[PDB]
Tab-separated table of C-alpha atoms and ligand atoms in Angstrom:
chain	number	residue	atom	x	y	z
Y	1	UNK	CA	0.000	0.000	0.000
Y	2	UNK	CA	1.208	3.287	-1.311
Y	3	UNK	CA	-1.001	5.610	-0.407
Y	4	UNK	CA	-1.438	7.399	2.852
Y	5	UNK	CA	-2.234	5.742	6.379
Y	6	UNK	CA	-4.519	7.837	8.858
Y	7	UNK	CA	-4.144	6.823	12.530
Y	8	UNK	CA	-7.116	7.500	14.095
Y	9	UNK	CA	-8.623	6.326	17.591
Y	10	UNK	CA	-12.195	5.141	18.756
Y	11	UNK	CA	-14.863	7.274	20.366
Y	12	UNK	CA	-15.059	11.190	20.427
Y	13	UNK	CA	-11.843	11.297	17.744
Y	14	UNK	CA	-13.299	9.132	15.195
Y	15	UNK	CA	-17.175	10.581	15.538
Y	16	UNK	CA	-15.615	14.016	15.097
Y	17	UNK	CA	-12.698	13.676	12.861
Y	18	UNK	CA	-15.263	11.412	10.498
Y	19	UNK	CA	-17.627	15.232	8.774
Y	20	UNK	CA	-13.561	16.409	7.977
Y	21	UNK	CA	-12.897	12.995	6.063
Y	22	UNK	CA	-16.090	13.132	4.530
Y	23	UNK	CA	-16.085	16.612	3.203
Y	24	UNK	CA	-12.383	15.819	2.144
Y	25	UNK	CA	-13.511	12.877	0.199
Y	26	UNK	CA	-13.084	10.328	2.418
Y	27	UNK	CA	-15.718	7.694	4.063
Y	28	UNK	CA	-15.516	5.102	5.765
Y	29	UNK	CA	-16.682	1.833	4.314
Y	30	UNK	CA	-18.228	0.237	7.152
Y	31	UNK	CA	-18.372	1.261	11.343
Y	32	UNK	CA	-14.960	0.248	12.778
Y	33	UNK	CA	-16.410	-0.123	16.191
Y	34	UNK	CA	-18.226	-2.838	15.132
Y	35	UNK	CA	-14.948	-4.893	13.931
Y	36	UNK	CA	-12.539	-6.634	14.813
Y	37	UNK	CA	-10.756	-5.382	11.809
Y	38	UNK	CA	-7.703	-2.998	12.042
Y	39	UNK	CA	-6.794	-1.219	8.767
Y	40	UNK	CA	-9.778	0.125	7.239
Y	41	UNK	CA	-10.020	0.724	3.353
Y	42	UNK	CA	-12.262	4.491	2.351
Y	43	UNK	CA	-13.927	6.052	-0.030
Y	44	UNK	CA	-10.632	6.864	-1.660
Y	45	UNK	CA	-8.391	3.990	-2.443
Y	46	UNK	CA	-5.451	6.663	-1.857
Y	47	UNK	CA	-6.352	6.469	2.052
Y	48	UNK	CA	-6.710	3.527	5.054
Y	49	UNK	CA	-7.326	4.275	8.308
Y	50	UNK	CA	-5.873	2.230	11.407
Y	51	UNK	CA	-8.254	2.478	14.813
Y	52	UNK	CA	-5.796	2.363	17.504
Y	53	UNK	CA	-5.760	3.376	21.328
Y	54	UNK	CA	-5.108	7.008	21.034
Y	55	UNK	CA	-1.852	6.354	23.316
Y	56	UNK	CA	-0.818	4.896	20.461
Y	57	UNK	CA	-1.566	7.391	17.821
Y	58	UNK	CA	1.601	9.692	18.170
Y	59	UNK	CA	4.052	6.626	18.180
Y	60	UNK	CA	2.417	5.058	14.954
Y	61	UNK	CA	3.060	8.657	13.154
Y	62	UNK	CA	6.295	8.715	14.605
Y	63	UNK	CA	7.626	5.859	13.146
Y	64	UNK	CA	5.817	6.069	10.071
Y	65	UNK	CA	3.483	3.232	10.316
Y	66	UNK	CA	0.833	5.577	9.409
Y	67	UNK	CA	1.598	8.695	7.147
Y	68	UNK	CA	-0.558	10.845	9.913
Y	69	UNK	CA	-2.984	11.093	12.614
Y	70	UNK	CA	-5.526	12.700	15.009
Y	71	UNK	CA	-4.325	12.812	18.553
Y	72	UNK	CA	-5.610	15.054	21.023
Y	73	UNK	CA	-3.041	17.635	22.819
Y	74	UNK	CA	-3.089	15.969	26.114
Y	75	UNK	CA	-1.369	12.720	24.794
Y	76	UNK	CA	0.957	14.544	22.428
Y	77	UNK	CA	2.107	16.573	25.610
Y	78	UNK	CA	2.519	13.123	27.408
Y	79	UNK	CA	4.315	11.846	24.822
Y	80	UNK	CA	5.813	14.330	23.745
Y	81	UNK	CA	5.908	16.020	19.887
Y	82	UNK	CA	9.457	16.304	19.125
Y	83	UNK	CA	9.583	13.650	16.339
Y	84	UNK	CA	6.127	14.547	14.447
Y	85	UNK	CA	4.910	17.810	13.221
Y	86	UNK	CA	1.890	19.688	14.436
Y	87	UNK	CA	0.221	20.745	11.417
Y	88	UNK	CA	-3.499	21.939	12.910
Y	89	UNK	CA	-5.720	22.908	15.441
Y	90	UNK	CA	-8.878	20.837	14.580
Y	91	UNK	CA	-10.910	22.223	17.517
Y	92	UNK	CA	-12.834	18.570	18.014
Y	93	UNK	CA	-12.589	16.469	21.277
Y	94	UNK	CA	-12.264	19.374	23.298
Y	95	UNK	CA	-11.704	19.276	27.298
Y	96	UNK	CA	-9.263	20.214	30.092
Y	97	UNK	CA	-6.455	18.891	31.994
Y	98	UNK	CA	-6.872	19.755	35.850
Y	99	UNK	CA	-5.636	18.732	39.193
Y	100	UNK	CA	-8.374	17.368	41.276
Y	101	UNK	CA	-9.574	15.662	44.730
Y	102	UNK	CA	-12.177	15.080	47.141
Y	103	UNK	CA	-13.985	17.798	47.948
Y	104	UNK	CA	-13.044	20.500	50.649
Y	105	UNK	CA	-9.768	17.825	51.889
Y	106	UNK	CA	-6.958	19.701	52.721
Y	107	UNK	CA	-4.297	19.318	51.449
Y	108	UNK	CA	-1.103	17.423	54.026
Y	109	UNK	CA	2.162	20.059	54.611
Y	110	UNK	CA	4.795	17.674	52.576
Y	111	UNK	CA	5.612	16.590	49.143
Y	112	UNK	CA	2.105	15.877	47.201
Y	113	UNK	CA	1.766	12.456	45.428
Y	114	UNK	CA	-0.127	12.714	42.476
Y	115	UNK	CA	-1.917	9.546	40.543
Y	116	UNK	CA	-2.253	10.423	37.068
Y	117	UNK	CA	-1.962	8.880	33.349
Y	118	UNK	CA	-0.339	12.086	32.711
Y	119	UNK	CA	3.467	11.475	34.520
Y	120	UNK	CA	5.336	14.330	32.854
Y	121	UNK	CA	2.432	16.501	32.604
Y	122	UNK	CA	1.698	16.487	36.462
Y	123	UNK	CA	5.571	17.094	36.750
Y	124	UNK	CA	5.658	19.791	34.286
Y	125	UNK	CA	2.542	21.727	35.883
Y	126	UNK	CA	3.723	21.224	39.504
Y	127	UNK	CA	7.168	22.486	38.497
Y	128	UNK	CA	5.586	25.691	37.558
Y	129	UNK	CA	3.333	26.196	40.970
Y	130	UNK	CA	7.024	25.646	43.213
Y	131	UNK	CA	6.293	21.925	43.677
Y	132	UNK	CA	8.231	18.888	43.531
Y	133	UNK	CA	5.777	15.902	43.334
Y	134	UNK	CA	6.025	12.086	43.052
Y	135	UNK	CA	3.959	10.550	40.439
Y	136	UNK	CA	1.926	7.587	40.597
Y	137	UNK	CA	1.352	5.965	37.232
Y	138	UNK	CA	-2.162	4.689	36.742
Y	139	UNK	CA	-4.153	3.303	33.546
Y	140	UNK	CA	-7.404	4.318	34.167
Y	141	UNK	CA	-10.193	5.320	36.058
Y	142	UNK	CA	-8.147	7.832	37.864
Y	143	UNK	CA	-11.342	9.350	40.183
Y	144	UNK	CA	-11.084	6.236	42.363
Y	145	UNK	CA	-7.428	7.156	43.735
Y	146	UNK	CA	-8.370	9.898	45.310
Y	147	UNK	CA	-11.239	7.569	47.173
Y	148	UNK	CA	-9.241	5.357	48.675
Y	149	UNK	CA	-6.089	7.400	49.660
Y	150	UNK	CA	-3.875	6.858	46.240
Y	151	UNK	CA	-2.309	9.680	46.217
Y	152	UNK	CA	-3.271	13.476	47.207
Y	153	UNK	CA	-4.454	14.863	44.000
Y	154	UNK	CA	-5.375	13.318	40.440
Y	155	UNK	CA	-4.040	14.605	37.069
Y	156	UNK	CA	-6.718	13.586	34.607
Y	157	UNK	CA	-9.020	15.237	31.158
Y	158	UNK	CA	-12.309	16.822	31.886
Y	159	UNK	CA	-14.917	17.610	30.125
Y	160	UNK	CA	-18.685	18.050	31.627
Y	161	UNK	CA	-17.255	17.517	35.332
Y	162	UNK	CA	-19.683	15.301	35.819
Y	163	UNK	CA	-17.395	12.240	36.590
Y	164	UNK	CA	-15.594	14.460	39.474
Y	165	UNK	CA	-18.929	15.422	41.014
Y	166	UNK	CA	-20.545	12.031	40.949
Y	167	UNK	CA	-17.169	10.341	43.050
Y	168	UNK	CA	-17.199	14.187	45.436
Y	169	UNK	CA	-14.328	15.300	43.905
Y	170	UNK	CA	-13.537	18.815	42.972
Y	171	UNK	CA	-11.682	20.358	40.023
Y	172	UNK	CA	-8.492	22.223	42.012
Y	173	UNK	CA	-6.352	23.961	39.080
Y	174	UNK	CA	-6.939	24.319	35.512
Y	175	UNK	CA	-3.555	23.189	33.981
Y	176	UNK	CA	-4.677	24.022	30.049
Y	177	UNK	CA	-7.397	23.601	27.335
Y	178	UNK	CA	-7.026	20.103	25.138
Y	179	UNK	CA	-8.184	19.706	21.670
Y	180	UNK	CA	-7.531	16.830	18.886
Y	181	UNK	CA	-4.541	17.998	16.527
Y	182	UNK	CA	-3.712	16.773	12.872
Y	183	UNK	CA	-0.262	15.217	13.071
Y	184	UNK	CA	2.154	13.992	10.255
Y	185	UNK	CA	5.272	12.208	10.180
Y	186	UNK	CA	8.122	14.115	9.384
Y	187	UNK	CA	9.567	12.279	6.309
Y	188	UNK	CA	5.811	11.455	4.821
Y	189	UNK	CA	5.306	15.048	4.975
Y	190	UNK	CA	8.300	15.338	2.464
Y	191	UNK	CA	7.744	12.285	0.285
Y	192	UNK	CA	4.079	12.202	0.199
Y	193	UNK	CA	2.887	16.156	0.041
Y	194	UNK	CA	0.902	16.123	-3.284
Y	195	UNK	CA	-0.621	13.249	-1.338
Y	196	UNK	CA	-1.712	15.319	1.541
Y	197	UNK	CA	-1.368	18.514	0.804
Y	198	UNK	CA	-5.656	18.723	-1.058
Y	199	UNK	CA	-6.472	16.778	2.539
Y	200	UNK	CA	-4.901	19.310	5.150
Y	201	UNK	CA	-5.942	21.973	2.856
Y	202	UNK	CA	-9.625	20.773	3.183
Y	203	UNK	CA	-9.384	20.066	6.863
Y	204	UNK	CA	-8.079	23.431	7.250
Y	205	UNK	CA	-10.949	24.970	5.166
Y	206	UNK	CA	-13.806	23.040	7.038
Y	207	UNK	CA	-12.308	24.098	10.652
Y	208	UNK	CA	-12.465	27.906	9.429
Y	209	UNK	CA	-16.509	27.359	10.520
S	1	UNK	CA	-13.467	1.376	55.973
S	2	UNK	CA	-11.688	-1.099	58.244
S	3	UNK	CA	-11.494	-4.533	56.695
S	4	UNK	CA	-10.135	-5.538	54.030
S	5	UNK	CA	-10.225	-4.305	50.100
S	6	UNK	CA	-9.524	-6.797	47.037
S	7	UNK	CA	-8.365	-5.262	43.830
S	8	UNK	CA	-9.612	-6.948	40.335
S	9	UNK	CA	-10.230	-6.405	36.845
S	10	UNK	CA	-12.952	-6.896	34.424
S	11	UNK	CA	-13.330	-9.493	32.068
S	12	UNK	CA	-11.449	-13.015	32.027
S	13	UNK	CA	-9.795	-12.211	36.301
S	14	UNK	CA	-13.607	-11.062	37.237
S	15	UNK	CA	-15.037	-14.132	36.075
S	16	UNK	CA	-12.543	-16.645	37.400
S	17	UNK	CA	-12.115	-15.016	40.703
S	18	UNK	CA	-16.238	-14.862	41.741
S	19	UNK	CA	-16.397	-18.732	42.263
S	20	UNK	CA	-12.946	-18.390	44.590
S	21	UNK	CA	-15.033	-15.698	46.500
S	22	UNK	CA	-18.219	-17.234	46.604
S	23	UNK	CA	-16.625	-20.153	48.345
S	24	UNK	CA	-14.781	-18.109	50.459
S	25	UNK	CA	-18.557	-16.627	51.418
S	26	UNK	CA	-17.816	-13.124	49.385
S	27	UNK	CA	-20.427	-12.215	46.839
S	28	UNK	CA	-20.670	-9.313	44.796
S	29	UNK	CA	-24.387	-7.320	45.448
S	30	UNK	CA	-24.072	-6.833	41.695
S	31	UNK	CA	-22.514	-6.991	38.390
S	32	UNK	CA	-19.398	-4.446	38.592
S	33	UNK	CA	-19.248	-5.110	34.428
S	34	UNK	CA	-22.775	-3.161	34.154
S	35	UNK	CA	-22.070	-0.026	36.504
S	36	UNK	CA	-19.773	3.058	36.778
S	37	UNK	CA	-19.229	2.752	40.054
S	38	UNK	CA	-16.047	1.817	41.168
S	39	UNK	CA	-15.846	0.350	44.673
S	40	UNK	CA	-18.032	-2.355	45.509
S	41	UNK	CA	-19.751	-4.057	48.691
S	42	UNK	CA	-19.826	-7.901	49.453
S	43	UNK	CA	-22.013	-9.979	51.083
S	44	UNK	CA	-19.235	-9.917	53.850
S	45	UNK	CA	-18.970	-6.324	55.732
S	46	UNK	CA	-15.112	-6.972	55.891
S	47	UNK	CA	-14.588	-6.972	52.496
S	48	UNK	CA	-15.027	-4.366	49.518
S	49	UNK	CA	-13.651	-4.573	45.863
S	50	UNK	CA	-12.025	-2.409	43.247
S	51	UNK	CA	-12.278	-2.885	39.736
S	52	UNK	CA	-9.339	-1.460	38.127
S	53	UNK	CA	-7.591	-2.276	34.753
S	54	UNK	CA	-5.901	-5.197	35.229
S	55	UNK	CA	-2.452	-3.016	34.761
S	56	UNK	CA	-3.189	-0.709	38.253
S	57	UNK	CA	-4.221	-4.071	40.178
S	58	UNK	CA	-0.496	-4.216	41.870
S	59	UNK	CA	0.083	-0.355	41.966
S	60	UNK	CA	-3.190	-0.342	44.150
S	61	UNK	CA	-1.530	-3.596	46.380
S	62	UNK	CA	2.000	-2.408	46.736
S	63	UNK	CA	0.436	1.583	48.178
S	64	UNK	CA	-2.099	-0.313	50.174
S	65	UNK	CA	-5.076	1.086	48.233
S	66	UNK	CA	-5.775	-2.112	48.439
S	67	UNK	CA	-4.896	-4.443	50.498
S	68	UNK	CA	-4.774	-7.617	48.471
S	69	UNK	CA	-5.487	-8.456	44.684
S	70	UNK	CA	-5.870	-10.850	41.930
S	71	UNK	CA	-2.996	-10.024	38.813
S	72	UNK	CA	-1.977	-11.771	36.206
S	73	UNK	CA	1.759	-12.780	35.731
S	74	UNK	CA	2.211	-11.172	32.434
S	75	UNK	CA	1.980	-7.881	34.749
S	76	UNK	CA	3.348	-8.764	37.816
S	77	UNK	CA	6.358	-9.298	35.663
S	78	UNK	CA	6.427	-6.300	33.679
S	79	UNK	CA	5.467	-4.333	36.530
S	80	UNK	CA	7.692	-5.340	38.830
S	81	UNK	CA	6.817	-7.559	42.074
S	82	UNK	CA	9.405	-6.539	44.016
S	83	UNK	CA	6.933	-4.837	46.894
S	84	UNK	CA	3.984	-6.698	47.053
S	85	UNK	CA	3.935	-10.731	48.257
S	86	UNK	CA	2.756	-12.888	45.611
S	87	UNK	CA	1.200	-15.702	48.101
S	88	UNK	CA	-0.500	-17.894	45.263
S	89	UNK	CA	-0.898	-19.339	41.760
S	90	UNK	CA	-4.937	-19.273	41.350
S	91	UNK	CA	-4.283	-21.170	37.857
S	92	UNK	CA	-6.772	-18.987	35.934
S	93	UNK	CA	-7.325	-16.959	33.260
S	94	UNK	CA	-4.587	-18.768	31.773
S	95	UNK	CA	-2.187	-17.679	29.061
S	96	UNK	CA	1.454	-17.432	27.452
S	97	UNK	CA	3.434	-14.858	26.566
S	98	UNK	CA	4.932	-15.253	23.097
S	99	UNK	CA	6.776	-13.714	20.905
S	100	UNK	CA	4.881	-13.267	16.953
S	101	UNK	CA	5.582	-11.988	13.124
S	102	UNK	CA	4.152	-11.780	10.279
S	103	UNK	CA	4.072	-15.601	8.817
S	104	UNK	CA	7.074	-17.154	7.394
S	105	UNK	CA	8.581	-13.214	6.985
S	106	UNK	CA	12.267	-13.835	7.906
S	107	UNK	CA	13.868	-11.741	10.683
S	108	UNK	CA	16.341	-8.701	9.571
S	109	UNK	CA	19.851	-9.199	10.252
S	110	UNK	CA	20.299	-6.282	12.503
S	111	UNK	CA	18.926	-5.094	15.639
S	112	UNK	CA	15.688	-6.409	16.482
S	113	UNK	CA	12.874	-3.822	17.070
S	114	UNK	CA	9.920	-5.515	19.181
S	115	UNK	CA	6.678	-3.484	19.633
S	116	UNK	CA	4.620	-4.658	22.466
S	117	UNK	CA	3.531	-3.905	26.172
S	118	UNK	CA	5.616	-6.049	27.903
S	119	UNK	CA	8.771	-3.649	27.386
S	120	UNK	CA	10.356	-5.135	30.468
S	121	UNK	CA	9.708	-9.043	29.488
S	122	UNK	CA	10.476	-8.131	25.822
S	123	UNK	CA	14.010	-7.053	26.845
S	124	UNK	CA	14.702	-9.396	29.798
S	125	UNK	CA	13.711	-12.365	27.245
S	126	UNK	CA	15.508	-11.290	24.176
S	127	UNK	CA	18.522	-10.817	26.306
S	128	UNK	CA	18.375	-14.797	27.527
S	129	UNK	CA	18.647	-15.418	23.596
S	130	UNK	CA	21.884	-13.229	23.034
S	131	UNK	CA	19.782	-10.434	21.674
S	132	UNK	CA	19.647	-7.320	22.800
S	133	UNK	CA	16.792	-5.194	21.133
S	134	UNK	CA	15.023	-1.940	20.664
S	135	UNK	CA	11.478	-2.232	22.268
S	136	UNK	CA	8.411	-0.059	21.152
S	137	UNK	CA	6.102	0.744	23.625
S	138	UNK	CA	2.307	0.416	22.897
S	139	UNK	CA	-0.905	0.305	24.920
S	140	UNK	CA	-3.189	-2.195	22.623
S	141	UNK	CA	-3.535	-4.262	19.836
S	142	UNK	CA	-0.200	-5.556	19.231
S	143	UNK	CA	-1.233	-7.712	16.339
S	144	UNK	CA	-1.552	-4.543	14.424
S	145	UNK	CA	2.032	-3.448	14.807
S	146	UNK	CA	3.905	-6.220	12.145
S	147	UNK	CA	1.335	-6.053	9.672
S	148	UNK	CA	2.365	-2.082	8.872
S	149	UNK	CA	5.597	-2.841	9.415
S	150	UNK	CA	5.964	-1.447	13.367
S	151	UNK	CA	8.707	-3.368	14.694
S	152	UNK	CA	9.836	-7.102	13.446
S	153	UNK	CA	8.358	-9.003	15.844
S	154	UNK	CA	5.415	-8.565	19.080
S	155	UNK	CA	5.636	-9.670	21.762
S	156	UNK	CA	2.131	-10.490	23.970
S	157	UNK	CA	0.043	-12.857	25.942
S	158	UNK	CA	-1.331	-15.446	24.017
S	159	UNK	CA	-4.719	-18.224	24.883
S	160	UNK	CA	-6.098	-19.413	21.694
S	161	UNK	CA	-3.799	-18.283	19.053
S	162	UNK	CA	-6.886	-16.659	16.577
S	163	UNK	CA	-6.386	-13.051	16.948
S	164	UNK	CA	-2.586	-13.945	15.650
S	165	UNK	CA	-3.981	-16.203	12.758
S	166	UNK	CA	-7.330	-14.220	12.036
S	167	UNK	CA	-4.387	-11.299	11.210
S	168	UNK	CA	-1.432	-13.640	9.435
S	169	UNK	CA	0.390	-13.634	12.406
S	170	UNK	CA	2.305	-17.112	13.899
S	171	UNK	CA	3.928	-17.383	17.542
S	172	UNK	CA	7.620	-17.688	16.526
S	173	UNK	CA	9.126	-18.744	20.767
S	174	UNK	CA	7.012	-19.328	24.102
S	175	UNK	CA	8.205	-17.025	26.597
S	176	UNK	CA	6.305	-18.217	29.400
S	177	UNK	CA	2.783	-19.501	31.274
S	178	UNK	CA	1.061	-16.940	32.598
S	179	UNK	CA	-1.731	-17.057	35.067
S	180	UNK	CA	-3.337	-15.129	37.811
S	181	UNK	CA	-1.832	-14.638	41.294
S	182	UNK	CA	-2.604	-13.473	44.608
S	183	UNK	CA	-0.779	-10.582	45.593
S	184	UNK	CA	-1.062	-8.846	49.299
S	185	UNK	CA	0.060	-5.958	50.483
S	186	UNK	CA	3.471	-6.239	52.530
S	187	UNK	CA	1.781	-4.283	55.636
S	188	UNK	CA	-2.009	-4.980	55.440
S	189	UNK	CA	-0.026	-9.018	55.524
S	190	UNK	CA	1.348	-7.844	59.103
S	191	UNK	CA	-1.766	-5.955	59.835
S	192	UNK	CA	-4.649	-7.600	58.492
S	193	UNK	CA	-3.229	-11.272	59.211
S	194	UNK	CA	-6.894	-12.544	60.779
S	195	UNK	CA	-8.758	-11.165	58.075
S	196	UNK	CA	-6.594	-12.191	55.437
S	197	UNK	CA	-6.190	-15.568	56.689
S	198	UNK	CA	-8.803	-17.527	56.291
S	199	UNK	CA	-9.950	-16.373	52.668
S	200	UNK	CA	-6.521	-17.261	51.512
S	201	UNK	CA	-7.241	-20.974	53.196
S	202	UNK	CA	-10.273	-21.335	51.471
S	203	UNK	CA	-8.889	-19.886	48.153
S	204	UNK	CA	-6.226	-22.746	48.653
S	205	UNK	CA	-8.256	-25.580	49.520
S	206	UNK	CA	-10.442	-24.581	46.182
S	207	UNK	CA	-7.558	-24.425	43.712
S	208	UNK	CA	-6.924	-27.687	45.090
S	209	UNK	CA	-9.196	-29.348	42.794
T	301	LIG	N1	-11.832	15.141	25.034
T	301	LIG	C1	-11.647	14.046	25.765
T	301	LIG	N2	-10.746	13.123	25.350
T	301	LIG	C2	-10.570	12.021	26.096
T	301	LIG	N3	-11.169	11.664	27.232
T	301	LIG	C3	-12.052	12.602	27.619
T	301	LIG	C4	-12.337	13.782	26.964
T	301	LIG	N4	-13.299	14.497	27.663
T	301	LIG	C5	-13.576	13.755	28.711
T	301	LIG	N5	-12.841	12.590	28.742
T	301	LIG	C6	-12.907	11.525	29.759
T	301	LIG	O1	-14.213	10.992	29.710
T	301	LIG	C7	-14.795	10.894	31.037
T	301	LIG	C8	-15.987	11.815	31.125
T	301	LIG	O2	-15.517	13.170	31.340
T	301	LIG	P1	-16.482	14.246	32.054
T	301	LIG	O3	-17.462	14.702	30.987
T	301	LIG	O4	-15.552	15.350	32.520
T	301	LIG	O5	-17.144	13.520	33.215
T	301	LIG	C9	-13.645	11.165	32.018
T	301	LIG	O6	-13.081	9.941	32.481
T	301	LIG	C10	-12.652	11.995	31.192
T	301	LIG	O7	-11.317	11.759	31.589
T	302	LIG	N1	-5.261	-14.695	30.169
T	302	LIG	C1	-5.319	-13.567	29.468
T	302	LIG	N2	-5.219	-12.382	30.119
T	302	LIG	C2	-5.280	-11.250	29.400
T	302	LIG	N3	-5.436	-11.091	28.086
T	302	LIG	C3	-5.526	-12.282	27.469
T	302	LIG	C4	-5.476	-13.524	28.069
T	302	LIG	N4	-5.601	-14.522	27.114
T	302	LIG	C5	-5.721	-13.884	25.972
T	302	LIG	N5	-5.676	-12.515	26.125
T	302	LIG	C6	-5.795	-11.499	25.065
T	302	LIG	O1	-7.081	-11.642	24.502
T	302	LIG	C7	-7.024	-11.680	23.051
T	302	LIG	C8	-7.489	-13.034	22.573
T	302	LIG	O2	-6.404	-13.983	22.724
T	302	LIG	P1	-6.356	-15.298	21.794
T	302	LIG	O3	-7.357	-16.271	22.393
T	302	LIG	O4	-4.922	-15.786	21.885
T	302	LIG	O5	-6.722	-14.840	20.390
T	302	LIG	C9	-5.589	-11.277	22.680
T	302	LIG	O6	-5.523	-9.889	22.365
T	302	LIG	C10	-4.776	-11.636	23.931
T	302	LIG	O7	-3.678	-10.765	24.109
C-alpha cells in the first residue's frame, strides 16, 4: 500500500474527525467499532485508516506506520511532539487537563503524590506552581485514587465535570485547554505532500466554521 | 473502611475469581461489568472490591489502596513484584506470553525492534537469547504493529492463538505460562493477618481441585 495511512482512535476522535474525512472525500466503508478489523479501506483507495488506542496514535506517526494522525493535545504533551509535526488545530474532542480531589480535603504540609496517566504533565505543571511531586502511574479510572487514599491529588481530562462530582471530587487547578490535533510524520510530509497537501488543505478549510 | 479491600479487573480475572469468593462466602451485590461505580460491597462487611484495569491491580496492592489483589503474571512481571507478596498461583485466566511476526517473513539481520507492552519481558527475554533489542512501547492491539511494518516481531500474551492467525500472524518462541496470582500488600499481611487468613485458606483448599 502506497497511499497514505490515517491513525485515528475510537470514540469522540473518530465521531468528530469522520464530517472532515467526509467533506475531504473520504468515508468510511463500514463502522470500525463494530470490527474486529484494524486497517480500514475508504472512499478513496489513496487512504486507510488504522483504529488504535489514542496512546498509540503519536508513536504510529512517529515511526511512520501511518503517514498521519488525530491525537488530542493531552497525549501529544505526554508523549511528547518532538519527532512529528503539528500541522493543525482541529478544535474537536475538546476538554481540560486539571488537578483534582475530594472535595473540601486539605491538602497534608509535605511533598504531594499525584496519581495520574499524565506522569510528565503532572511534573511539568507542579514544576511551575514551586512543587516537587512524586507521580503515581495509573491506567485508568483515575477518580477512584483519590477515594481510597492513592495519592493526594489526580491529574486527569475533563470535560462536563460530571465524573468528578458524581465520586465528590472537585476540580483544584486548571492546567490548560485540550483539543484533537492533525499530526504527520516528518519524512511522509516530504515524500508524500501532493498526497496530503488537497487533505490538510480541506481540513483546514472546514475548521475555518 | 476497616477490613479488608480486594483489587480486580474486568473481564477473564472477574469471572474466574467470583467462584474463589463465593466459596470463600464473598459475593458481589451486583454486576461491577454493568455499573460506573467503582468500589463495591460484598455480602461480607469486611470486604469491599475495586475494579481497576488489570495493569493498576499491583500499583493499588504495593500503596495499600488495596490491600490484596488478583494479577496476572504477564503484569506482575512487567510491573515489577518486588513490593507486594505474591502468596498464590490461582491457575486462571490462563495464558502465554509469546513472541509473533508476520508468517514465514524472515527476521532482519540487525537489531531487532519488538513493539509490544511487555517492554520489560520483551528485553529481559531477548537478552536470555543473546539479543539485545530496541522495544516499542504500545498500549493495545499488538497484532496490528507487524502487519504495517511497526517493529519485526510482538511480543504479547497469548490463549487461543486466533487473533494472531485471524491477522497472518504465527507465535515464533514461548516465553512463558502466565496465570493469575494473589498478591497482598506487605503491611495490610502484618496488619490484616486474621482477616486475610482464612480467605486465603479457602482460596487454597479450592484451587486444590
Ligand atoms: N476530550 C476528551 N478526550 C478524552 N477523554 C475525555 C475527553 N473528555 C472527557 N474525557 C474523559 O471521559 C470521562 C468523562 O468526562 P467528564 O465529561 O468530565 O465527566 C472522564 O473519564 C474523562 O477523563
Ligand atoms: N489470560 C489472558 N489475560 C489477558 N489477556 C488475554 C489472556 N488470554 C488472551 N488474552 C488477550 O485476549 C485476546 C485473545 O487472545 P487469543 O485467544 O490468543 O486470540 C488477545 O488480544 C490476547 O492478548
Amino acid at each position: 500500500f502506497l497511499g497514505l495511512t490515517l491513525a485515528l482512535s475510537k470514540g469522540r476522535i473518530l465521531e468528530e474527525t469522520m464530517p472532515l474525512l467526509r467533506a475531504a472525500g473520504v468515508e468510511l466503508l463500514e463502522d470500525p467499532e463494530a470490527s474486529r478489523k484494524l486497517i480500514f479501506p475508504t472512499s478513496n483507495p489513496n487512504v486507510r485508516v488504522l483504529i488504535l488506542r489514542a496512546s498509540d496514535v503519536p508513536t504510529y506517526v512517529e515511526h511512520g506506520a501511518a503517514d498521519f494522525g488525530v491525537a488530542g493535545k493531552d497525549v501529544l504533551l505526554e508523549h511528547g511532539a518532538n519527532h512529528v509535526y503539528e500541522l493543525l488545530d482541529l478544535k474537536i474532542a475538546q476538554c481540560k487537563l486539571m488537578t483534582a480531589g475530594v472535595k473540601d480535603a486539605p491538602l497534608p504540609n509535605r511533598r504531594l503524590r499525584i496519581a495520574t496517566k499524565y506522569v510528565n504533565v503532572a511534573r511539568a505543571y507542579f514544576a511551575s506552581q514551586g512543587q516537587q511531586v512524586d507521580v503515581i502511574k495509573l491506567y485508568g479510572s483515575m477518580e477512584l485514587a483519590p477515594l481510597v487514599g492513592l495519592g493526594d491529588l489526580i491529574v486527569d481530562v475533563v470535560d462536563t465535570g460530571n465524573t468528578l462530582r458524581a465520586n465528590g471530587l472537585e476540580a483544584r487547578d486548571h492546567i490548560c485547554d485540550v483539543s484533537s490535533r492533525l499530526i504527520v510524520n516528518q519524512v511522509s510530509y516530504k515524500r508524500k505532500f501532493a498526497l496530503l497537501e488537497p487533505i490538510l488543505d480541506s481540513f483546514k478549510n472546514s475548521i475555518n466554521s
